[PDB]
From a paper:
In eukaryotes, two highly homologous enzymes, cholinephosphotransferase-1 (CHPT1) and choline/ethanolamine phosphotransferase-1 (CEPT1) catalyze the final step of de novo PC synthesis. CHPT1/CEPT1 joins two substrates, cytidine diphosphate-choline (CDP-choline) and diacylglycerol (DAG), to produce PC, and Mg2+ is required for the reaction. The first 6 TMs carve out a cone-shaped enclosure in the membrane in which the catalysis occurs.
The structure of xlCHPT1 in complex with CDP-choline and Mg2+ has an overall resolution of ~3.7 Å, and that of xlCHPT1 in complex with CDP and Mg2+, ~3.2 Å resolution. Densities for CDP or CDP-choline are clearly recognizable, with the cytidine ring coordinated by the side chain of Asn64 and by the backbone nitrogen of Ser124. The two residues do not have direct interactions with Mg2+ or CDP-choline but His133 is ~7 Å away from the β-phosphate of CDP.
Author numbering:
A (entry chain B), B (entry chain A): 20 to 383
The structure:
Amino acid sequence: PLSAQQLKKLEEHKYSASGRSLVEPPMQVYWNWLVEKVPLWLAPNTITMVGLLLNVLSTLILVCYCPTATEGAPFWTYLLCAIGLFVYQSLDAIDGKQARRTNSSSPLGEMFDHGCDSISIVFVNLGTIAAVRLGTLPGWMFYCCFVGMFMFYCAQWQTYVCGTLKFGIIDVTELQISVTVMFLMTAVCGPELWDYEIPFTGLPMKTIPLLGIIGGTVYSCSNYFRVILSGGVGKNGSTVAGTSVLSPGLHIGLVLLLALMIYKKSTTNLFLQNPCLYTLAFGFVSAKITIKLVIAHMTKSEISLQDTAFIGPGLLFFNQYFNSFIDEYIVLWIAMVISFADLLRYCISVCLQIATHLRISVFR
Amino acid sequence: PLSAQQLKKLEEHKYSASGRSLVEPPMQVYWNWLVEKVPLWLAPNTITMVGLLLNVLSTLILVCYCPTATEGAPFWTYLLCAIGLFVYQSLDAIDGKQARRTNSSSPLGEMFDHGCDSISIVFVNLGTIAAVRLGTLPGWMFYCCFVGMFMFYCAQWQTYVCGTLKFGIIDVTELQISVTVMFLMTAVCGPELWDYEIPFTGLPMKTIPLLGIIGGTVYSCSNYFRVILSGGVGKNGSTVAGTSVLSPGLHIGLVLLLALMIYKKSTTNLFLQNPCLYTLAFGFVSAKITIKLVIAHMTKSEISLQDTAFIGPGLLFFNQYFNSFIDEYIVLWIAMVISFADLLRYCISVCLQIATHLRISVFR
Ligand SMILES: Nc1ccn([C@@H]2O[C@H](COP(=O)(O)OP(=O)(O)O)[C@@H](O)[C@H]2O)c(=O)n1
Ligand SMILES: Nc1ccn([C@@H]2O[C@H](COP(=O)(O)OP(=O)(O)O)[C@@H](O)[C@H]2O)c(=O)n1
Ligand SMILES: [Mg+2]
Ligand SMILES: [Mg+2]
Ligand SMILES: [Mg+2]
Ligand SMILES: [Mg+2]
């Protein structure tokens, strides 16, 4: 999975990040106080795995009770989702702090952190789509999920063009806090709160989050794109690996364009009837693509545009080309299963290789 | 177009071929007698260019008077085709002999010979399809043209796996002689000769050539495939370049499979109504692919499966995917023009680079 030269360049890697947000000081104090009361013999990898597992299980439960994201759910699911998200954020901060001390830092930890972040953001966007019941506005339904995916990939990609993480003021902390408080408010008030049309403007309440999200969208994009153009660390304005500046753009554009092309020619309402399956399959594809870029920018190697991850999308596209010989409901399940198995195999193989080389005992 | 190392390996190349056919001695004596009466100041490249030009012009005239390969043509076209084919064979033998003497041999000459052979075999197969009026048997119409293309590519490919050309007993000489005599017989007797159903077996006369061709087909394939499997020249049974044995098979399979896939889902009789345009576009594609393999096996480099020659087939495939927004008659013309321009540009660039390096003055 990893070549000898690339693995050799993996060592002597120094993690670096600069930036601060508005709510950073108080939550920072809280996380510091909580990490003073953590057991000393616990490994950070177990912490991040536990956090990701809790978040995934809770979001999966919420999705299972709300297919198509247009029905209602009890307070049980919303409360569990809020608790899981809060615990995920807390464990992220705590295992970061505990890995920074007691000389347990390793390059595999950052890889685990980034992969967990990808999966968690996909599941969080699914949960916040299902909770608000955004099935009454079919126009704004592709955009939300796939713009969350696109923004995470763009953050990784602008990190590729530079050497240090740059943190803004509207970063993940505020997003997670807002989503948690929104889940709590929906649980306490009921799923019909977003059907409490505001006495003016003739628009429902669901426009209040969405518009803001769009605003944040633009803002985030702005920053990222600047680092794409003005930023340069190598011998020129090119990437740190010496390759072209806009290579990952082709990967993300291919994924999103292929998703849109399959969506627009379904002829049987493939997406508006099975949104969770569609989003999960393409989220696994995008998660593998993002992990590849994470590994690429940890080292100084180069990425290609030929992967054994377009199997599922390829099957969908070639089953759409021929008119119909397999109904477009089992093909989606096959694609999701293939993508999940491929991502799991890739992650397990890379983790095993790194553990064998550095004799880390990943879980210890 | 040619890398420095590959161009350096181009030099110190020795042409080698072994084999003999049944009719080789008499035609060999004739060609020797004719080359004793050739001017000494004429370059072989001009000879092969003249032969290819005559063959192409005559076949183009015959095709223009017989679109769809189901109408009749005057004796003028058939006589011109027979004369052009005979002159092409004669000039091939003569310029080969004249290049072998008077120290004018160069690696560019073999490249010209192979490219001319590719174009000539494509046009000869079109001419023999049009002359026999094989439009009354739509089942056996894809097979003929594309099996001619496939056989030439397979001959080149088995040459790739070894170092020397192997000549059988049913080689190009007998094919050309048979086609010439068939053109002469059709001209003297008329296009209706193939509508003179043989008093027995209840089959028309056009089965007499076709079956034989099929037989020859199998025979040729046999020999080639043996060299594909038993043959080995490098450190192992692999190719002389050290790469995989069955890499060009992917190229030829992609071309033929894509042609068949576009043919089988035309919905408007794209091939059975415009056979000459279809065959010419895919013949230009296959000619460029074959020239690439010729250059590869002249040197010891490696070929890829990513070319700027699938533009035309890509446009056809993606215009078929979307139902129809451009009628499937201008797209074919665009594809043919693009393929022809690409092949001409590639050939001109390679010829200019070789002439600049070796200061040959190609035409002199
Ligand atoms: N399981 C883990 C998680 C993080 N780490 C390391 O600990 C550092 C602290 O990360 P963090 O979570 O505080 O930082 P951010 O989450 O803000 O990116 C990471 O950059 C990794 O190098 C680790 O070694 N093992
Ligand atoms: N225009 C040409 C044609 C052939 N030649 C060379 O002359 C040799 C004789 O080829 P040939 O035509 O007698 O052989 P075949 O046609 O049987 O392959 C070729 O192998 C080339 O090396 C050349 O230098 N310039
Ligand atoms: Mg962390
Ligand atoms: Mg994290
Ligand atoms: Mg010759
Ligand atoms: Mg020749």
